[PDB]
Amino acid sequence: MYSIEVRTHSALHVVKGAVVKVLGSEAKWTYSTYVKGNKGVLIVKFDRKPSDEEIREIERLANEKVKENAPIKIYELPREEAEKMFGEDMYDLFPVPEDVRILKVVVIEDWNVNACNKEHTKTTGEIGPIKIRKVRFRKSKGLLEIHFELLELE
Amino acid sequence: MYSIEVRTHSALHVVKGAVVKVLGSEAKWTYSTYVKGNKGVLIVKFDRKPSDEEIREIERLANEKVKENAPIKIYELPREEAEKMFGEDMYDLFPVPEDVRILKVVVIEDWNVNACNKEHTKTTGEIGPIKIRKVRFRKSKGLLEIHFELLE
Ligand SMILES: [Zn+2]
Ligand SMILES: [Zn+2]
């Protein structure tokens, strides 16, 4: 088993992938994330407020990735190499300090790659049904908030 | 007198103000800053590559603020007080940690307000002629690089 929070954190990587698939590469940059219990907040850099249909799609695709039970692999390589093997996409808006010479990159094949040092579940199925509760688009900073919560079902 | 670097850092605040005056409020958020000797790099969040004429205006405007010899005031208030007194504009894209309950906000009336703890010149004139050398717009991240160097 996995703690609910380790579960919610993992959902973030899944939700991010769904976001990029639906909104495109322009929403590929993460600004920040927060997790509290079964609730999660993914803020990505974007330029508009997604339509209700797109939100639905992000949700659908995110839940489909959960059911596929895809593995969440975690490679540990040299900054330089990882830099060339995964490219710029493994990062967020905010750079991982340069004092760090070795990176732990989380990968969900064809979905999301991110230098992350936190604990993740071994597979996407271990996350469970995800529900997007609120979506806020902050015009000034041009950031998109995707609020979601995991579900106490089975 | 002031160190060349203290000068270049101060120019940052001046250049940022010129950038917002010319490009608008959408270029109001700073992503990062770098200063080495007489060289300075201001990266702001933006969506397009400014035209050559706009770059010229940013430069002009920036140098005119230098000649006005405006004072660079430095207020030190609680964070809750600066929050309401200067609003969100005093910040950058990345927030000053919440462990800091007292802020040092740099202000150049009607030009730029920024929570900054570094050393600044007492007035804009003490900066000197600014020259924008290169401007790079990185489409992926949507960031605009304003490269400039002081002349002294
Ligand atoms: Zn992670
Ligand atoms: Zn400063």
Short description:
2 copies of one chain form a homodimer. Chain A has 154 residues and is α+β, with helices and mostly antiparallel strands. Chain A is built from 3 helices and 7 strands.
Helix and strand arrangement:
2 copies of one chain form a homodimer.
Chain A: H1 4-23, E1 30-36, E2 39-45, H2 52-67, E3 73-78, H3 79-86, E4 102-108, E5 112-115, E6 130-138, E7 143-150
PDB class: hydrolase
Keywords: hydrolase
Assembly: dimeric
How would you explain this protein's 3D organization?
The structure is a homodimer. Chain A is α+β, with helices and mostly antiparallel strands. The first copy, chain A, folds into 2 domains: 2-72 and 120-154, 2-Layer Sandwich (Threonyl-tRNA Synthetase, Chain A, domain 2), CATH 3.30.980; 73-119, Replication Terminator Protein, Chain A, domain 2, CATH 3.30.54. In chain A, 29% of the residues lie in helices and 31% in strands. Chain A is built from 3 helices and 7 strands; from the N terminus they run αββαβαββββ. The first copy, chain A, has a 4-stranded antiparallel sheet with strand order 1-2-7-6, covered by helices on one side. In chain A, helix 1 packs across helix 2. The longest helix of chain A has 20 residues, at 4-23. The two termini of chain A are 13 Å apart. The A-B interface holds A 25-26, 28-29, 31, 45, 47, 88, 93-94, 140-142 and B 25-26, 28-29, 31, 45, 47, 88, 93-94, 140-142. The site of one zinc ion has 6 residues of chain A, from helix 1. Chain B: Monomer and homodimer; the dimer is less active in tRNA editing and does not have a zinc ion associated with it. Another report shows only a monomeric form. Chain B: Functions in trans to edit the amino acid moiety from mischarged charged Ser-tRNA(Ala). Has little activity against Gly-tRNA(Ala). Chain B: It is found in: Cytoplasm.
